[PDB]
Short mmCIF file of all heavy atoms in Angstrom, two decimals:
data_model
loop_
_atom_site.label_atom_id
_atom_site.label_comp_id
_atom_site.label_asym_id
_atom_site.label_seq_id
_atom_site.Cartn_x
_atom_site.Cartn_y
_atom_site.Cartn_z
N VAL A 4 2.55 24.15 80.28
CA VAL A 4 1.38 23.33 79.93
C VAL A 4 1.42 22.03 80.72
O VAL A 4 2.51 21.56 81.09
CB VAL A 4 1.35 23.07 78.43
CG1 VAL A 4 1.11 24.38 77.71
CG2 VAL A 4 2.66 22.48 77.97
N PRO A 5 0.28 21.45 81.06
CA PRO A 5 0.29 20.14 81.73
C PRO A 5 0.71 19.06 80.75
O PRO A 5 0.30 19.06 79.60
CB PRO A 5 -1.15 19.96 82.18
CG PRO A 5 -1.93 20.78 81.25
CD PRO A 5 -1.09 21.97 80.92
N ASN A 6 1.55 18.15 81.22
CA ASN A 6 2.08 17.14 80.33
C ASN A 6 1.51 15.76 80.62
O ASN A 6 1.43 14.93 79.71
CB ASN A 6 3.60 17.13 80.41
CG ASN A 6 4.08 17.14 81.82
OD1 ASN A 6 3.29 17.16 82.75
ND2 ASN A 6 5.39 17.10 82.00
N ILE A 7 1.12 15.48 81.85
CA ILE A 7 0.48 14.20 82.12
C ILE A 7 -0.95 14.24 81.63
O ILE A 7 -1.78 15.02 82.12
CB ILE A 7 0.52 13.85 83.62
CG1 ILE A 7 1.94 13.65 84.11
CG2 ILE A 7 -0.22 12.59 83.87
CD1 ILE A 7 2.49 14.81 84.86
N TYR A 8 -1.27 13.40 80.65
CA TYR A 8 -2.63 13.35 80.14
C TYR A 8 -3.30 12.03 80.47
O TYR A 8 -2.64 11.09 80.93
CB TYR A 8 -2.66 13.56 78.63
CG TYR A 8 -2.20 14.91 78.21
CD1 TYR A 8 -0.96 15.09 77.62
CD2 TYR A 8 -3.01 16.02 78.38
CE1 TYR A 8 -0.52 16.33 77.23
CE2 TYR A 8 -2.59 17.27 77.99
CZ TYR A 8 -1.35 17.42 77.41
OH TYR A 8 -0.93 18.67 77.02
N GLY A 9 -4.59 11.95 80.21
CA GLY A 9 -5.35 10.77 80.55
C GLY A 9 -6.19 11.01 81.77
O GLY A 9 -6.99 11.95 81.81
N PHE A 10 -6.02 10.18 82.79
CA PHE A 10 -6.79 10.34 84.01
C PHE A 10 -6.17 11.40 84.91
O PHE A 10 -6.83 12.35 85.30
CB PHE A 10 -6.89 9.02 84.75
CG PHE A 10 -7.62 7.98 83.99
CD1 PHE A 10 -6.94 6.94 83.40
CD2 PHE A 10 -8.99 8.03 83.86
CE1 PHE A 10 -7.61 5.98 82.70
CE2 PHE A 10 -9.67 7.07 83.16
CZ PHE A 10 -8.97 6.04 82.58
N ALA A 11 -4.90 11.21 85.25
CA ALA A 11 -4.17 12.24 85.98
C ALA A 11 -3.99 13.45 85.08
O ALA A 11 -3.39 13.36 84.01
CB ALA A 11 -2.82 11.70 86.44
N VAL A 12 -4.57 14.57 85.49
CA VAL A 12 -4.51 15.78 84.68
C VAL A 12 -3.74 16.83 85.46
O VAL A 12 -3.95 16.99 86.67
CB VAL A 12 -5.92 16.24 84.29
CG1 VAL A 12 -5.88 17.53 83.49
CG2 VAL A 12 -6.63 15.16 83.50
N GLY A 13 -2.85 17.54 84.79
CA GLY A 13 -2.05 18.53 85.49
C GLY A 13 -0.60 18.12 85.46
O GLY A 13 -0.05 17.73 84.43
N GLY A 14 0.05 18.21 86.62
CA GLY A 14 1.44 17.86 86.72
C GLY A 14 2.41 18.92 86.26
O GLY A 14 3.62 18.69 86.30
N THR A 15 1.91 20.07 85.80
CA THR A 15 2.79 21.12 85.34
C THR A 15 3.49 21.80 86.51
O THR A 15 2.97 21.86 87.63
CB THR A 15 2.01 22.15 84.53
OG1 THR A 15 2.90 23.21 84.14
CG2 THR A 15 0.85 22.72 85.32
N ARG A 16 4.70 22.28 86.26
CA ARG A 16 5.31 23.23 87.16
C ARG A 16 4.54 24.53 87.11
O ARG A 16 3.94 24.87 86.09
CB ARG A 16 6.77 23.48 86.78
CG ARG A 16 7.71 22.30 86.92
CD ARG A 16 7.98 21.93 88.36
NE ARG A 16 7.04 20.93 88.85
CZ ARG A 16 6.91 20.58 90.13
NH1 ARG A 16 7.68 21.14 91.05
NH2 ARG A 16 6.03 19.66 90.48
N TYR A 17 4.52 25.24 88.22
CA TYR A 17 3.99 26.59 88.21
C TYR A 17 5.07 27.64 88.41
O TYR A 17 4.95 28.75 87.90
CB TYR A 17 2.92 26.76 89.28
CG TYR A 17 1.68 25.97 89.01
CD1 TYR A 17 1.36 24.87 89.78
CD2 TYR A 17 0.81 26.34 88.00
CE1 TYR A 17 0.22 24.15 89.55
CE2 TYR A 17 -0.33 25.63 87.75
CZ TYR A 17 -0.63 24.53 88.53
OH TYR A 17 -1.77 23.81 88.29
N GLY A 18 6.13 27.30 89.13
CA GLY A 18 7.19 28.24 89.41
C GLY A 18 8.33 28.23 88.43
O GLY A 18 9.47 28.50 88.83
N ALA A 19 8.09 27.92 87.16
CA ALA A 19 9.15 28.01 86.17
C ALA A 19 9.49 29.47 85.88
O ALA A 19 10.64 29.82 85.60
CB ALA A 19 8.74 27.28 84.90
N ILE A 20 8.48 30.34 86.00
CA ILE A 20 8.63 31.75 85.66
C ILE A 20 9.57 32.44 86.63
O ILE A 20 10.55 33.07 86.23
CB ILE A 20 7.27 32.43 85.66
CG1 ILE A 20 6.31 31.74 84.71
CG2 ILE A 20 7.42 33.88 85.30
CD1 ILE A 20 4.89 32.15 84.97
N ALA A 21 9.26 32.36 87.92
CA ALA A 21 10.05 33.05 88.93
C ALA A 21 11.44 32.45 89.04
O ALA A 21 12.40 33.15 89.33
CB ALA A 21 9.34 33.00 90.27
N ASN A 22 11.56 31.15 88.76
CA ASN A 22 12.87 30.53 88.73
C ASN A 22 13.71 31.07 87.57
O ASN A 22 14.92 31.29 87.72
CB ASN A 22 12.70 29.02 88.62
CG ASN A 22 13.93 28.26 89.01
OD1 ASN A 22 14.95 28.85 89.36
ND2 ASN A 22 13.84 26.94 88.95
N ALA A 23 13.07 31.33 86.43
CA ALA A 23 13.80 31.91 85.31
C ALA A 23 14.17 33.36 85.57
O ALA A 23 15.26 33.80 85.19
CB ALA A 23 12.97 31.81 84.03
N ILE A 24 13.28 34.10 86.23
CA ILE A 24 13.61 35.47 86.62
C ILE A 24 14.76 35.47 87.63
O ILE A 24 15.64 36.33 87.59
CB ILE A 24 12.36 36.18 87.17
CG1 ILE A 24 11.27 36.28 86.11
CG2 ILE A 24 12.68 37.59 87.61
CD1 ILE A 24 9.93 36.75 86.66
N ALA A 25 14.81 34.45 88.48
CA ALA A 25 15.90 34.33 89.44
C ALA A 25 17.23 34.07 88.76
O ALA A 25 18.23 34.73 89.06
CB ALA A 25 15.59 33.22 90.44
N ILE A 26 17.25 33.13 87.82
CA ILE A 26 18.52 32.81 87.17
C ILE A 26 18.94 33.94 86.23
O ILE A 26 20.14 34.19 86.04
CB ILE A 26 18.44 31.44 86.47
CG1 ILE A 26 19.83 30.93 86.11
CG2 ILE A 26 17.56 31.47 85.25
CD1 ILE A 26 20.65 30.56 87.31
N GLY A 27 17.98 34.72 85.74
CA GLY A 27 18.33 35.92 84.99
C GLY A 27 18.92 37.01 85.87
O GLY A 27 19.86 37.70 85.47
#
């Protein structure tokens, strides 16, 4: 989920999934 709220919107990681599949 995006964590920066207010004016700047977004800031989420997108590659958390493939990084977790990698460490698995």
Side-chain angles (χ1 to χ4, degrees):
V4 294
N6 47 359
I7 296 102
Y8 295 106
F10 297 106
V12 178
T15 178
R16 295 290 91 191
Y17 293 110
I20 303 164
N22 198 0
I24 298 170
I26 195 68

